[model samples]
Target: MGVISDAYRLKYTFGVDFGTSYVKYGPITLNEPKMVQTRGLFLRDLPESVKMRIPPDVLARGLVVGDEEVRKYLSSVRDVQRNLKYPLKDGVARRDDEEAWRVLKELARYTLAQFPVSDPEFAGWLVAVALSALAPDYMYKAIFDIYDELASEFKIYAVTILPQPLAVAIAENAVNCVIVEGGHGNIQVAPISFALIREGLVALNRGGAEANAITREILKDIGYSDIAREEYAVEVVKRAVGLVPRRLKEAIRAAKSDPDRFVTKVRLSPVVEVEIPREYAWTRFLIGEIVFDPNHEEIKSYIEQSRLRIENAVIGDVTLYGEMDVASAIITSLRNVSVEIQERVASQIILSGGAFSWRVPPGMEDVAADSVTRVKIALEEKSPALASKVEVRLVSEPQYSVWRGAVIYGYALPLSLEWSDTTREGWRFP
Candidate 1:
């Protein structure tokens, strides 16, 4: 039984990460999983001649996914903009958005289509899904319901759902650690001890979007007004120019004193090379600073000028803070858990997600720091003793952490375990 179970797990277990911007998913075989844009394009007003090219079911559903197919059916810019839907932009589907749920189900089916279930032993796939820690009970039900509907065709043996942060912890092999998962929509700070600390979750309204906001404003100021309006151009410029400052004010002063040292030229495309002059080189630090500390005095001017908007957002019973720095947010989350384990939890801080994947460009180490160092710096400022004991680090292959953890979790659990309403775990047979 043990040997057979292990073999089945290697072949049959699958993991899916329902990320805001993209879905990372696959069966556990090696280091990472595959990804698909977490979006769907609704086909409308297509000529009958164009309809012949699409699959009948896609036309029946009136939606298209996967880039190759979507590109062929796209009608107009305005129509594409109006119909292209991202269901989990806020990390959860709103209770009232029926179309969002439909798109979500279709995305799930789209993911499953990649693998063919042909083994005689394959009763179905033991699937695990990862979602935001702030996701509500209804979201859980919705996920289960989605799998149930697809069971007949897609064939899922059992299904389980876990919070994205917990999945990150499991991937890092840290049972007692805190996970700071930053995504495009929001940042989730969740403390884990053997399992997720439900109440010990702090959701911030800021994440890559906030960082992108600062980048946009800086681009506009540097005479890239046209590029600032295009997200792709803005993102390329942000990644090329952004750097976390060791000391916001000191870094700014250093850049101002020796602007030539900080001068950066970003090539958005072969023809369009954007340059940050000696005078405006100081603005690069602002891009990274906003991610860690939007409330910084330097960033406050942008807020005053109505260029950047940062405010508290209330989602369900949880408050999504806008301006709270990452360190304080981590502290706030840990306070909800048992005091006895708080120290142990703080010792292993795991930072994961695209937003935390910044670099410390060589020779600029003294001035610019990576995401891990910034977290350590902030924690040290709050309490040197705590910082001394802390071991903050970013997860490897941050994008695939959730999917890897999910496959591991599904493989580890006993197939005998049934779904439990109270614990909100175990496989739900469909």
Candidate 2:
């Protein structure tokens, strides 16, 4: 009660989500937080004219980069794509990579600077890093160093870290829900009892990245191969038309009943436009369904063509989820937790991530279902049959759950709290 009572104790705290794709962060009480692309544009990558416009204030912070000014150059500088490097491809930024650190540091500074100094105590707000699940200790230490430096410069009161899934649990106000946080690079299924069930952790090596792969392939088969390299276009197509069937085979079988009606199209202005023929529209289910179960024969040829083997391939220390389907991933995680809490967490599951944000068009409702229903039905098809009894639902905002949870947790906890390296939860100072 002590912690929950002072929910807004920190008047201007910050919740920073360090993701592979984008940094979703903002100060608490802010209506909408700002997000920055995680990748950085090297100065050499920018045109001479774009480079001069770089603000002196931001330039002095080092990295010779511009936050807003640099973005316009991304399109202007034809050779810039090769220069922009994303360091957290596997959800872990290398500890020793200066390029990655510099980009991240600049992003943090830029985010904090966005807030006007309206509050007198703005500089002293407690900052929380809402990080990916199973983020390494070195990663926590690296993130804390950013705040500690900021604290030295701007006088931040303190800083703490949180596992993203647990933060989703907080955001949803579900103390014991199992949260499967599906970010662009990976998905983490974490069971929460009173706190995160560390032993019950399950990792899926694929998320939206794999889905994007199939989308690109869909473009090739439809003779729109020219625009396939345009990732943003492909992503738009997926979100605009991707479907998850209640049952893959049966859904396809039904869609065959009305081939013309199932067809859809994605028109992204002059740059690209692709029609989803009846043959391709049925494949739309493969877009989202492959992420859940890549084992399907329909999805195999696409995976091989795209070289998406990395999702399930083991390279050195990393054992990607080669054979683990989404349902199996959930069940594996649930089994690790004590049976007493498994049922409770299963019934209160929170499905989050942009990948799960697919929609079923009005006419397609009978042919397809929402994200949760698709996964539940898929899970039930296989025995152990827990999906039948369990309840699963998407996060309300879906996009900001982790950040919202981070802000709430930071605000709810007492200011005296310190981060524990062992428990990886909040702690109080003496």
Candidate 3:
């Protein structure tokens, strides 16, 4: 049978997840699993001359120059520009509609090309774009227009919007699972049932970016500002020299004593010589202690007073959950938000997101295990009911779960519901 015939016989659907940091596409077939593809060029695969032509500022920011760069830059600058005049909050891509559309179009082109679909045949294809949150009407219409234009060249059949977290919840098959989706700028907590996301709670402005900023601040204090551009420096510090611990006073002294050695050990460049005081080793200890016990007045005060305003926003019965002690503050912030919603009892928790991927420090599974253990202990002392019912499981396929779930949902649509005017009305007829 031909490829198109096979696709029609099996019933195929495409799912695209436009995330803050990346765009992933997947195809789901009836009676088969899903296949996902990320949109970006591998650094090694880039032509050497083209790679060399990249601007220094872009390189220093650790960003790719094309679609990915546009997305990141717009997201970063959108809020700042608005604040100066219209006063818009973060994560809204209103100010940079043109740039956002440009990036989205490029992303769509990259995604569709991966399927080896020719422009002449794209019109018949059904594509669903999964957005991180419910975007503005204009943004949705813009995407629709772009996809419609593609149809003129090919055979586009249908286009739809899928909420990102809902897709993730479905992909997890999480029945009554509390999904903590940690993205670049914020963390979303939702109670999901079957393939539906409910309780759609959002913890604004708390995510990996905060963690990165904190790490950057700590590095600056420790005199590692010179090599700040290195992509792996923050990771090294997270692994080798983590947050303040009980022995923080001693660790700080050690860290200060041989800062240069630490840089060399981590394979970071642009090292500089610096004198360390006898008390320098105490810096690590201090940071470690802060990480472990965020309630420490000094540490709590520091985070609360941070320029990020995270400290002011996060409050009340904050508990940290993670395999690494370094993530204590973030976990605490999440807990604070949960408390606000009267969800003092966490029965079943699901961790899935970019941060939960394998590349993260100490890995996601390990982090989930550690967080579960810690939360279990804390609950036993604080809330007996929660401790007894608590179950922690990390959802596999952390990176592509959302898009995979979306594809599954799209493919399963025919099976889940009977065909009718309401159901089939929106579907295009060939």
Candidate 4:
């Protein structure tokens, strides 16, 4: 019976993670899911000369997807900014954003087309989609509707959506813990107790986007103003040079004191090799620091100059903080749970998502640290006693955690169960 059930799940179960920057998706057979950038470019504005190069069906739809395809047809920076649509902003799409909905639909269809099976026994797939914890009910309804439309071609027998942070917690197999999921647009702090997400969840307005913003500023200062305008180029430079400083002020002083230890170069293109001279090497700390604490003096100056702005946002009764430190965000989330489980939740903190996947270079270990160490230090500053009790962990596969968890969730859920309005579990027939 176990073997039969496993075989059935392997054949029919699938998971899709709708991340702000990328969509991760695949069946349970693959350990790691395939990802495509969560973006679509409208081909309506393309000139007749350019239109001739694209396929007929794509032209009829007037939308182009897949990272390479989008990049290939991206004629200019202006056109890209105007036509390219990233559906989810801070991990939730606006209720009435038709353009975003269209892009999302295309992305779903594109991913489903990637793995086509020719089995006569295939009836349909049990699909699980992962989204931000902050996603509203309307967004859930919207996704179900899209899958409903897709049922004809892809044959989705059962479907359900799960929160991204909850998926991370399940993927890590942590029963009682706080999950800090930092993605491209925002951060979610969700505490789980006995395999259930507790009430005290916090969402932050900061994530990798803030880091990329700081990197863009540094690039402009280092004589790469043109490259700074390109979002992809800025991300490449940020990942290549960014470091999470153990202590921002001390790290800056050390880098300035021993310039040779901090100096590094980033090459974006064949002709462009941007070097962070000893004088500007200290700027690297600012990139990662912004994500951890946007209230720092240096970051404050950016806000003063109107270069960066972080503001408190309200989304569906949840107050998303802008300037709150990462440690405070975790604490706030834990506070929302019952007093009985607060200690248990605080004891295990799991960090997931690409934004938390920073690395410490060999020699910079003392000055720089990875996400787990950084979170521990941040908590230490707030309360040493609490920090001592904490056991922070970074997900092994940060980028794929949600997808894996969603697959497990889909597999475990019985097919006979119907969708629940209050509990928000079970399956929906498409």
lDDT score at residue 148, model 2, on the 0-100 scale:
73
TM-score of 1: 0.93
Q: Candidate 2: where is the Cα deviation over 4 Å?
A: 1-10, 47-70, 76-82, 121-123, 270-272, 313-319, 427-430
For model 2, residues 1-430, the per-residue Cα lDDT tens digits are 2322344345667789887787888888777567776777665555667657877664454353334755655676657445666757767877778888777777777777776567553436567788777567887888878777766555566677888888888888888777888878888888898778878888888888888888888788888887888777888888877788777888787777767877886678976567898876678787888778778877766556755564564423445585588788888888888878776878777899777887777876776878888777767776445776777789777788888988888877765545677766663321
Higher-TM-score candidate among 2 and 3?
2
Minimum summed lDDT over a 10-residue window in model 4 is located at 1-10
Q: For model 3, give the 10-residue run with minimal summed lDDT.
A: 82-91
- What C-alpha RMSD separates each model from the true structure? 2.4, 3.3, 9.2, 1.8
Q: Each candidate's TM vs. the true structure?
A: 0.93, 0.89, 0.61, 0.97
lDDT of each: 0.85, 0.74, 0.48, 0.85
Model 3 whole-model lDDT (C-alpha atoms): 0.48
Please name the candidate that would achieve the greatest lDDT relative to the true structure.
4
Q: Write the per-residue lDDT of candidate 4 for residues 1-430, one digit (tens) a residue.
A: 2322667778778899999998999888896999999999987677887778668887898887887788888864246656899988678888888999999999989988888867877777778999789988888888998999999888777788888887887787878888888998998888887555646888898899999999998888888798888888889989999898999998999888988888898777788887888888988999998888887887787788878878888888778898898999988777788888787888998999999989999867889978888889999998788899999999898999999999988887777677777777777896
lDDT of 1 by residue, 23-134 (tens): 9988776467878888888777666677787778878988877766666655443454558888987788887888788788988898889888776767678889997888
Error of 2 at 303 (Å): 3.5
Ranking by lDDT: 4, 1, 2, 3
Model 1 has how many clashing residue pairs? Answer: 0
Q: Which ranges of candidate 1 are over 4 A from the true structure?
A: 1-4, 45-57, 68-75, 79-81, 118-121
- Model 4 lDDT at residue 260: 81
Clashes in each model (backbone N, CA, C under 3 Å)? 0, 2, 28, 0
